DNA sequence: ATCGGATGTATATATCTGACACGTGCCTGGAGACTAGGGAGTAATCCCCTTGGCGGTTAAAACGCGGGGGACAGCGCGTACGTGCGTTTAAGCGGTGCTAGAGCTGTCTACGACCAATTGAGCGGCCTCGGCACCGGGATTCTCGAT
DNA sequence: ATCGAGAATCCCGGTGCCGAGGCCGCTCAATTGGTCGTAGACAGCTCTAGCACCGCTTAAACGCACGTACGCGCTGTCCCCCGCGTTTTAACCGCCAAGGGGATTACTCCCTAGTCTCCAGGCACGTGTCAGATATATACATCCGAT
């Protein structure tokens, strides 16, 4: 299933992920294909935060959904 | 300076900028508090504290001790001129007084 | 005995000393570097890192920071370096 | 348990370690330091508040604290405090 | 002004006695901007890793610290992904007497081992302190793919 | 035959000893009882924390030391060595304590 | 009820305070004066201390009340809080 | 133009209440105004400090009463407290 | 009171209640002001100013003058004990000094 | 247009009149120099604070309110000039 | 033939006259010039309101009168009628102005 | 012990003038009605710190005596200060000219207040060891009566 | 000028104890993010008074001569704190025990900041007249030399 994520830098990324994959799994996959660390990633769907422990399918997220990525810059 | 870190480190101070900001806001001093006031106040407080502590440590070293005691603080405050003028009304508990005997009373 | 040349140079700016100041840690450096340290640094001596706030505050009232006997030997030993500055 | 009581103990200890690396401090001297810090804070803040109210303003900016420091402190302590305040504010802004 | 002369003497000293396992050069004709190359120490899990960093000298030197960033990316507890470096000597107690060669040596030393006291990211520091192997294998998978 | 110190050389020794110490000089229980008497005169059935009487005694000692310093200065100004109640009254008047 | 406790401040205590002050020769008519001035000062401080500990609807005199009473009179004290 | 507030006519009313015929010059009026303002500042500051000292957040009548008891000497303190209590009692009904 | 007249008249006070309340609220003293504080403060201020005005008027009438001048204010403040103690560290512009001469300076018999 | 040694403006009869108001019958010959010195010290102390108060407000003319405020902070309240 | 008063009498008459009077004692223009000279040291080219100068001079007169009263008290204490600079120094030091 | 100048101060009377008491327009701040929400009053509970008490022991206070040093009274002097008068100096009062700068109005842009979530700096509690207190011995240094 | 004996003080070494510098667990407030009402930063205009100048007084300052009274030094007397020794007293330490109330939590309720609308109390402004400051001429308090 293809989903769309939007970052703060104006870059849109398409993820080929299944609903069975948990939040940790999708974080690992997006880190592998984009480099952004999973911990610094905050996921926003319909204006809500997504918890790592629960699975992605718990959010009732369907094909071509829109996600927002939040980067937590610490230090500097 | 770069953001996204603790405020006490951005200014290079040790006193808490956030605590000073909260005290200024909730101290009934003014309706609004600027963003540069707590840093300035923290810097001044740190300077004064370091200035007193250095002289106190010098007095402690002179007294062959390796610990700061109220007598050392009193010696450091009173021996200096500017700090004596500033702290001219306070009274350090268990501090004593400087050794001073009038020249007339000395034996001839 | 001898002021020499390599030891004479300022440890910061690599230049000739101008109105040298002697820190309580027996560190010697030119007045421009010390001044720029006051308003653009941590107010402590860079080398051995000891605070000199009290000494500077006491001396600035009486204007005794400059080392007269060192400045005299600097003038008499290297007039050519001093006249350029 | 007992309610929290804020204090300046750790900060004064850090400053003392910064100045003298191998010198301790007793509890009574710590109380003296806390009282001195509170007194100076009260003096500066009250002077700044009065001086800002004198100008029909409603904000305590850095200028008010600078002028309060200029008024309260003696001749040389005031200059050094102003210099190090400019230090901190310039380093914080940029 | 006077800063460029100090930079010239410092670069001459760098060239006459280059430190082992650190390299530096002028990224551009303009004097302030510099580039540097670092490769990991032998006693480290970063073997065979080459890294590029860019350093920007301030308007006046050395009274203010010089900004440093990593154009490449490193997986370290004390460095962000964007390249910001939390170094105690760099910002908290930078002194004019120090030279940037000492700064690079400090960067190498921090690359050898992180500092518990001021973690850049608490999670990675928690990972590092909790045990050894779970940082070992991410470091091992990380080193070759990004360096080469 | 016994070694008797000349009158005057013991006061200087006492001055040197006491100006070097930091201990309290007034007694504890008499001062506490006096404070309690004053308080019960002002208000009945009061209780005192130990730090309260400690601070009261510290303040009283510092004030009396300052008063005696000023009194000694006045007595020395009067071309004398002994201190007299007139010196204390004048010091208090000039300090503005009585007026 | 306590009566005539000002005599608890005996002659040697006054002499020790005077020696710390820096006097060499003390008259014999000064002890009553010192007792009187000490009583006046104690009354003045304790009045404000009692007013503070009475406004707060309490019944004990904490060190905070005394430190505040001293601070009100231009006699700031360090050591017991603040 | 701009308006400046003062306690002029109030002091004049009090003076006429206490002395029907005697007048007052301008400088004496300025002095009385300054005295009133200074006393107001003192009492308000003491009341605010007392309110802060007990972790409160209001200034009711009792803080003003305690501040008056502190600031004024004995007989004047007693008279001021009595007058204030009477004024509050009359105003509340 | 009747809850229909002015606050000053309701409290029986010549000094204002609204102005004192506004100054207390806008004077940066507390986040709240009680409903009885301005009345108490105005009563205290009125009592003190009435006392000083009475003393000054008495002193002026004693001096065969129908107007109150700063000299009369200084005489009234200094002569009384409580007023002098309350205003010990204040200076009256064009106030003068109480007439007194030390007994030693007087001429001998 | 600078000014020099105007401290001599405080004249000996003026100091004599001030002492007479204070209640002094006989005056020594060295009083005047000490009086002038104390005068200069006090005036400097007040003027520094007044000038600082003026400088904060970005003004160029010191006002009676500035002097009153400086005196009040210095420990000597003044009445009659507005406050 | 000429008639002159005994020393010490017209001084008392001057005291009685001046204590009753209220007008300022020091001349206006010298004081204004002194104030301007002192002020120009801290900052250049200031301008002074008249009321500020008047207030400064009034505070000056009050302070000097108080200091002279204290000095006279010291002089009478020292069993003398004449005041001298040591009396002024003692009065200032007790007050704590110089410390 | 007063007397007679002789000076200065106090007292009675006209006068005219600038400031104080008062009338008036109006507008900005004070007054009146409604509401909601958080601060403050009230009740019940815990245990911390205050108060009261008794036995030992001993450092400190109280009392008495010899006397030496300082407080104080009196004499003498000579010099600095008070008093008065002729003379030089600049403060004081009036009038005019001008512009630097205080004070107010109109725009609007950037700094600061507010609310949620969150997690790490900072506070309460435990603990162990080293720095400081105390005792015993000796070495050093003021001190004074007799030379 | 000094020698030496009695006494007070400082150094040094050994032993012991308690508080302070560090570690661990945890609860709350500082940080970051965004949004939104308004405060003062700035430009322009006005128009007040602060500064500069001049001229005419006459009030205050000044220098000098002369006398005198008191600040200071010296001498003498006496008396009263001081240093020391002996005796009495209660401060101080340790211990135990009872309980008053200070601090805390939970609940509720009502006081007041906030908003909007309406109107009069006091302020800026202008005006009348008389309280008193000034000038002039008597009447008494007070000081000084000399009886
Ligand atoms: Zn240099
Ligand atoms: Zn150094």
């Amino acid at each position: 299933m293809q989903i769309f994520v939007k970052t703060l830098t104006g870059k849109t990324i398409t993820l080929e992920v299944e609903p069975s994959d948990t939040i940790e799994n999708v974080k690992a996959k997006i880190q592998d294909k984009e480099g952004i660390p999973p911990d610094q990633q905050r996921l926003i769907f319909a204006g809500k935060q997504l918890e790592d422990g629960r699975t992605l399918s718990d959010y009732n997220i369907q094909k071509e959904s829109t996600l927002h990525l939040v980067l937590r810059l610490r230090g500097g | 300076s770069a953001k996204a870190c603790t405020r006490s480190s951005r200014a290079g101070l040790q006193f808490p900028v956030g605590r000073v900001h909260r005290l200024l806001r909730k101290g009934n001093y003014s309706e609004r508090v600027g963003a540069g006031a707590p840093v300035y106040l923290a810097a001044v407080l740190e300077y004064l504290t370091a200035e007193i502590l250095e002289l106190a440590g010098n007095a402690a070293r002179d007294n062959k001790k390796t610990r700061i005691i109220p007598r050392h603080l009193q010696l450091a405050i009173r021996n200096d001129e500017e700090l004596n003028k500033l702290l001219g009304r306070v009274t350090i508990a268990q501090g004593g007084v400087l050794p001073n005997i009038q020249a007339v009373l000395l034996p001839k | 005995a001898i002021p020499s040349l390599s030891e004479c140079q300022c440890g910061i700016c690599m230049e000739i000393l101008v109105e040298p100041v002697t820190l309580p840690c027996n560190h010697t450096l030119c007045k421009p570097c010390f001044q720029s340290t006051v308003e653009k640094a941590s107010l402590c001596c860079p080398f051995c890192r000891r605070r000199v706030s009290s000494w500077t505050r006491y001396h600035t009232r009486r204007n005794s920071l400059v080392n007269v006997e060192l400045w005299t030997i600097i003038q008499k030993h290297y007039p050519r370096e001093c006249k350029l500055r | 348990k007992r309610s929290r009581k804020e204090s300046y103990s750790i900060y004064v200890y850090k400053v003392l370690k910064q100045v003298h690396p191998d010198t301790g401090i007793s509890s009574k001297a710590m109380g003296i330091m806390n009282s001195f810090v509170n007194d100076i804070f009260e003096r500066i803040a009250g002077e700044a508040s009065r001086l800002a109210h004198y100008n029909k303003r409603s904000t305590i900016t850095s200028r008010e604290i600078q002028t309060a420091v200029r008024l309260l402190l003696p001749g040389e302590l005031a200059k050094h405090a102003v210099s190090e305040g400019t230090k901190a504010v310039t380093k914080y802004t940029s | 002004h006077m800063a460029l002369k100090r930079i010239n003497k410092e670069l001459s000293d760098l060239a006459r006695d280059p430190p082992a396992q650190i390299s530096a050069g002028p990224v551009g004709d303009d004097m302030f901007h510099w580039q540097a190359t670092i490769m990991g120490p032998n006693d480290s899990p970063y073997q065979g890793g080459v890294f590029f960093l860019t350093i920007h000298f301030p308007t006046d030197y050395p009274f203010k610290p010089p900004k440093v960033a990593f154009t490449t990316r490193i997986y370290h507890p004390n460095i962000n992904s964007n390249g910001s470096i939390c170094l105690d000597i760099l910002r908290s107690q930078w002194s004019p007497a120090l030279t940037i060669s000492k700064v690079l040596l400090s960067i190498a030393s921090l690359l050898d081992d992180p500092n518990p006291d001021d973690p850049k990211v608490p999670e990675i520091a928690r990972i590092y302190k909790t045990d050894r192997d779970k940082y070992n294998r991410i470091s091992r998978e990380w080193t070759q793919k990004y360096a080469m | 035959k016994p070694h008797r110190y000349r009158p005057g050389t013991v006061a200087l020794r006492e001055i040197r000893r006491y100006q070097k110490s930091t201990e309290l000089l007034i007694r504890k229980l008499p001062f506490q009882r006096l404070v309690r008497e004053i308080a019960q005169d002002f208000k009945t059935d009061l209780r005192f924390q130990s730090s309260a009487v400690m601070a009261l005694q510290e303040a009283c000692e510092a004030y009396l030391v300052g008063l005696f310093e000023d009194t000694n200065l006045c007595a020395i100004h009067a071309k004398r060595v002994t201190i007299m109640p007139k010196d204390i009254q004048l010091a208090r008047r000039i300090r503005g304590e009585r007026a | 009820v306590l009566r005539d406790n000002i005599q608890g401040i005996t002659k040697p205590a006054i002499r020790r305070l005077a020696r710390r002050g820096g006097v060499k020769r003390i008259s014999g008519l000064i002890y009553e004066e010192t007792r009187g001035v000490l009583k006046v000062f104690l009354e003045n401080v304790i009045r404000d201390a009692v007013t503070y500990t009475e406004h707060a609807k309490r019944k004990t005199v904490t060190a905070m009340d005394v430190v505040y009473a001293l601070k009100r009179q231009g006699r700031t004290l360090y050591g017991f809080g603040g």
Side-chain angles (χ1 to χ4, degrees), chain A residues 56-73:
Chain A
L56 183 63
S57 54
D58 291 331
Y59 310 120
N60 189 359
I61 280 181
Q62 295 324 110
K63 166 80 79 159
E64 290 316 308
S65 294
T66 70
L67 265 293
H68 295 266
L69 162 69
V70 183
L71 210 64
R72 181 41 59 195
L73 295 94

Side-chain angles (χ1 to χ4, degrees), chain D residues 59-78:
Chain D
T59 305
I60 308 177
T61 59
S62 81
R63 269 176 32 95
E64 330 298 335
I65 311 292
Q66 189 161 304
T67 313
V69 163
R70 287 254 283 282
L71 268 69
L72 287 187
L73 303 198
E76 274 296 341
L77 283 177

Side-chain angles (χ1 to χ4, degrees), chain C residues 15-16 20 24 27 30 35 40 42-43 45-46 49 53 57 64 70 76 83 85:
Chain C
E15 303 302 312
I16 301 299
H27 292 110
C30 75
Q35 285 293 354
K40 292 180 175 66
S42 84
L43 188 150
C45 63
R49 191 194 289 245
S53 57
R57 199 192 78 250
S64 177
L70 181 63
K76 74 98 175 179
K83 65 169 53 59
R85 309 303 175 85

Side-chain angles (χ1 to χ4, degrees), chain G residues 17-33:
Chain G
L17 290 179
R19 294 293 199 247
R20 178 173 281 175
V23 302
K24 178 151 161 262
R25 207 185 190 256
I26 307 156
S27 166
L29 270 195
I30 211 167
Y31 305 132
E32 314 274 21
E33 196 82 29

Side-chain angles (χ1 to χ4, degrees), chain C residues 10 12-14 29-30 33:
Chain C
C10 172
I12 300 299
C13 67
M14 295 298 102
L29 61 83
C30 75
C33 286

Side-chain angles (χ1 to χ4, degrees), chain B residues 7-8 11 13 15-25 32-46, chain D residues 41 44 60-62 65 85 88-89 92:
Chain B
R7 290 167 82 180
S8 283
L13 311 161
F15 275 91
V17 165
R19 196 186 280 199
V20 165
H21 190 61
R22 151 173 91 83
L23 286 176
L24 271 185
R25 270 198 292 108
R32 294 147 60 88
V33 173
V39 175
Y40 205 88
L41 192 42
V44 163
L45 286 179
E46 183 178 1
Chain D
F41 181 97
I44 290 181
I60 308 177
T61 59
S62 81
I65 311 292
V89 65
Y92 174 81

Side-chain angles (χ1 to χ4, degrees), chain B:
Chain B
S1 180
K3 214 186 289 292
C5 68
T6 183
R7 290 167 82 180
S8 283
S9 177
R10 289 169 66 187
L13 311 161
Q14 311 281 337
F15 275 91
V17 165
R19 196 186 280 199
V20 165
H21 190 61
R22 151 173 91 83
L23 286 176
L24 271 185
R25 270 198 292 108
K26 302 224 179 285
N28 274 329
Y29 295 113
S30 177
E31 173 184 11
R32 294 147 60 88
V33 173
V39 175
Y40 205 88
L41 192 42
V44 163
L45 286 179
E46 183 178 1
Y47 170 68
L48 283 187
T49 294
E51 188 73 47
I52 299 282
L53 277 179
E54 172 203 309
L55 291 160
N58 278 324
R61 194 91 47 72
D62 273 11
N63 208 354
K64 306 280 276 297
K65 307 285 200 70
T66 181
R67 186 162 298 176
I68 300 297
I69 61 174
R71 168 81 175 154
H72 301 163
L73 287 178
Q74 171 83 358
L75 291 192
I77 288 185
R78 296 296 172 236
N79 270 339
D80 188 12
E81 181 202 330
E82 305 285 89
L83 301 163
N84 178 31
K85 200 183 298 171
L86 171 70
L87 285 88
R89 305 320 220 172
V90 301
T91 289
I92 318 290
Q94 295 214 131
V97 304
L98 294 174
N100 194 357
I101 301 173
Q102 292 294 304
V104 189
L105 301 199
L106 292 201
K108 184 33 52 193

Side-chain angles (χ1 to χ4, degrees), chain C residues 23 25 27 45-50:
Chain C
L23 282 192
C25 57
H27 292 110
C45 63
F47 320 108
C48 54
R49 191 194 289 245
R50 65 183 67 189

